[model samples]
Target: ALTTTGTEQHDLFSGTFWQNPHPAYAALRAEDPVRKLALPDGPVWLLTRYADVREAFVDPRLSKDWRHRLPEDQRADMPATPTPMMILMDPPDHTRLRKLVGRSFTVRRMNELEPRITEIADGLLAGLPTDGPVDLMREYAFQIPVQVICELLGLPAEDRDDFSAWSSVLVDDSPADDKNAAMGKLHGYLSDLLERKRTEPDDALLSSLLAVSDMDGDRLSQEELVAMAMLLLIAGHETTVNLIGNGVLALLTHPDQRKLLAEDPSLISSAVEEFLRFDSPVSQAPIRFTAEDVTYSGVTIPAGEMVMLGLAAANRDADWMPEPDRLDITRDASGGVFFGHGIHFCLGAQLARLEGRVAIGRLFADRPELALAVGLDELVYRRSTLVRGLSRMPVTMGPRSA
Candidate 1:
């Protein structure tokens, strides 16, 4: 039997689903684990089950590259990125780029980034007006990750403020022209940034990318460098802002869970996993194209079809856990598919986890008096199919406890 907390199955991409996709996800999982839906960008065979979503990510036949999915003669005419983003490429380009970038984005590096992450969190929190109704999303949630990525990229501090706006417009359900314009301006900015970095190198990630190469001394092209930088900048923060935003929101609503964490700050490591499982930062993984026919639940998704994996739904799958909707900070939420699975899994996972734990852990410890300025229903979220984040998190951050 089809089960949903709503009247009917809502459109998987937008509208009411964005408000609370859990119910719709439940209905889809039960009734149509494999369903086709037409979206503004294109059509996709949406997979809702946990198993399907997991296997889909590691599936060899489901190619991430779409730039050459069209006819050879007509490939250049297809509307795609000028130089494929590393996330959108298949090996050997993906292999080469990831290997080069991977060395720089290691767990040891993210661990080294811990103190700085906490310091940035502290600085951002210190700047927030203590008594006012501050929009946490704009002021704190977005600030920490953006600054971290900017510093990581070795971008000028002066240019840091512009990124929130650029990324906001690009990720939301904006018109194609608007996104295209934002991409053009952003690409131009990075192109210049790379040129400047070449002349003036530093120890930052961008400068290192400019210097790093493969075993054969194969370096990234100008377009490749820019594409990668953009990927790091945009991909870097979008996942994390929500981790902090949603974590705070969850703590505010669930006082019991909040109280447990408050009593034992050590539970924060587990709590971070809870937030990732409860509401995924990236609700939908990037669109994947099938290189060959793929079947799920007896439904054949033909070659060249776009496939959307539901990370949010996968995290809450009943078969995967007990009382899936219930938020238990102590639950073993590790190894979930939210960060993603298989080859193209998020390289910044450790960085994001570090930032999330430190940022959120410290925020709660310092500001025990924090409370939402408005009710939960009054909140709004970014209209992005790929990432889930609050539009504004208006909350009254009372004075710190100590």
Candidate 2:
């Protein structure tokens, strides 16, 4: 029973709970592992325990595609205009689209981009003043991945200034009309770019995707291509930005872990994992709908319900690991569901990992004296049920001598 009448209310979507969900999550995991609460949109089944959340990922009963559901399934209100990304799609469409894009977004491609990511990081770091306060979120963390994903798609560098504003509205708890407006602007932008790439196919991803088609030789429609492009731009950076930003914040707050990593840069690999487990980037996994009745922790959710997987909650669940709350970079940080599990795992996991490695690794190696310029509590976080990241992180890059 998730009570709302008391002094503390558990809102999975917005308000105080959206800002700091751990207390509510802890209570739910303890008292109501599987609870159905009414959101402003409608009632949603929230799964907090790692076991329930983990099983929900592969549970055939849980369907990601909201369109094919029957008439009685009332949770989804299909957009009049479709801009479907595979994350929101289920097979056989999800299978097809993922396969086509998978051919291009391979780990090998990410490996090849390592030098470029490193160079991108190097350039950004060099551009910053040797000694001054800067909003690292705006200046560095956001810059690296934006350029990487943009270049991967061959989108123009000149047009990136608007992406932050557009993506911010889409990811945060903004007005529906504003989100749609931003979506429309981005859809229009990518639509035109993709349309042009058809005639002017170049070596970049957008142009190369022109040749991609399902095994049946059916390629994506222009709208589908635009949708996928939007996915790449949105999904690509948001997580990576926080992975670097949150990872740094974690390190700065924990002097022991920072000293350990500074001593052994090899720890960057596991350090990234620890950062994810410690502070999840994507707070809520993409919502799934029930294809059939489902049960978790002795509670039953009827068919046709919106099921939200608590990634942040699952990541910190003690049942999953020892000292689940501690930030130990040296400890094995596997089993994190931040990128998720099952067929819908993040497409850019490797790319995000590389960006995290390069950005965090270089920043520490270069600055050596880096420190947070503002009080820890003073930093603000965005109010989005989807992704958890700093809205602003002011810091001194530390000293540098010419």
Candidate 3:
């Protein structure tokens, strides 16, 4: 199997890869579609091709029964035992969990929120430097998603300071010694918040959830509700942060693409999809537990092994996409697996798309002359296989005053 985690890197900033990882993927896709790996924890199967990965996503053998499936040793090594949020579960319960929040994520509901979302974008942009450099990720990109999620949850807008800290610890590549401790604290906080929301929910989801508990007698227990809330808040916040940041970084580095986008704001929608294809926010699909011995496409992965799907690699497979390396905003997205395929597909996909289009579109619209403050080569990038993204983008507000 293509061992992504083991690829050797030359330096601190450049770890095993510098440019896109498609070349590596191509080599593996041809050699073996699914390969078993022997790691300290036992074995893991890596799925690299578009079809194989998509098949694995829908396969019942790739179980999401996290509590029972994860090896005890793997759990001990992890800061927090992987909590199989609804997004990572198998049928029945997964269906029930998704339905609870499915109403709010409908396309019609998201379309209605567009105006408010734009308003939120404008309010954040207003705080930017009128005529200087700004780390868009900090002042603009990151805050937009944080605020949108807060608005969706009906939580106080200012609470992101707390939530972001908790999220950082959980998602960090090298979590701290107290990482598990931090998760415990965060879980406790969410438990309390869920209880409070049950009694005193405002116009946000928490309030609405309690007001209209179950449509089909599918009630969410307190723990389940808290887990769901935490999942939404975390996923809603980070998925798009990486999306906007990675997309902006791509444009800044590709001057031609940047010019094309500047000329036509409508390209924002397609550009976001390409960005999703180019550098997916969720770098790896959550680990899937193999139910029985299975070799996909002639490659053997024993049963009861941990495996992960490479979403980033699958997006750029040449067999699936033409000129896979090129970053064109005009590429057809109907066939892409950036948002994933099959049952585990992203539920908030509509909301993510809306946020991406409006955020990128308006940023360009409002600041027509915006350009990178530093040369594109000068920017540093995040080096985690889990979530590939830009560390920071130093960009001028607009060209210097004439």
Model 2 — TM-score against the truth?
0.92
lDDT of 3 by residue, 316-361 (tens): 8888888878999977676777777777788878888888888888
* lDDT for predicted candidate 3 compared with the true structure: 0.72
The deviation in Å at residue 129 for candidate 3 is 1.5
Q: What would the TM-scores of all predictions be?
A: 0.93, 0.92, 0.87
- Stretches of model 1 off by over 4 angstroms after superposition: 1-7, 67-82, 213-217
lDDT of each candidate versus the true structure: 0.82, 0.82, 0.72
Give the number of colliding residue pairs in candidate 1. 0
- Top candidate, metric TM-score: 1
Mark the regions of model 3 whose C-alpha exceeds 4 Å error after superposition.
1-14, 18-22, 32-43, 67-84, 176-179, 211-218, 375-378, 399-402
Listed per model in order, the count of residue pairs whose N, CA or C atoms clash below 3 Å is 0, 0, 3
Clashing pairs in 3: 9-16, 292-303, 293-303
Question: What digit string (tens of lDDT, one per residue) describes model 2 on residues 15-95?
Answer: 556456777777777777787878655677788899899888998789875642456554366552257777777778788
Q: Rank the candidates by TM-score, best first.
A: 1, 2, 3
**Candidate 1 similarity to native, TM-score:** 0.93
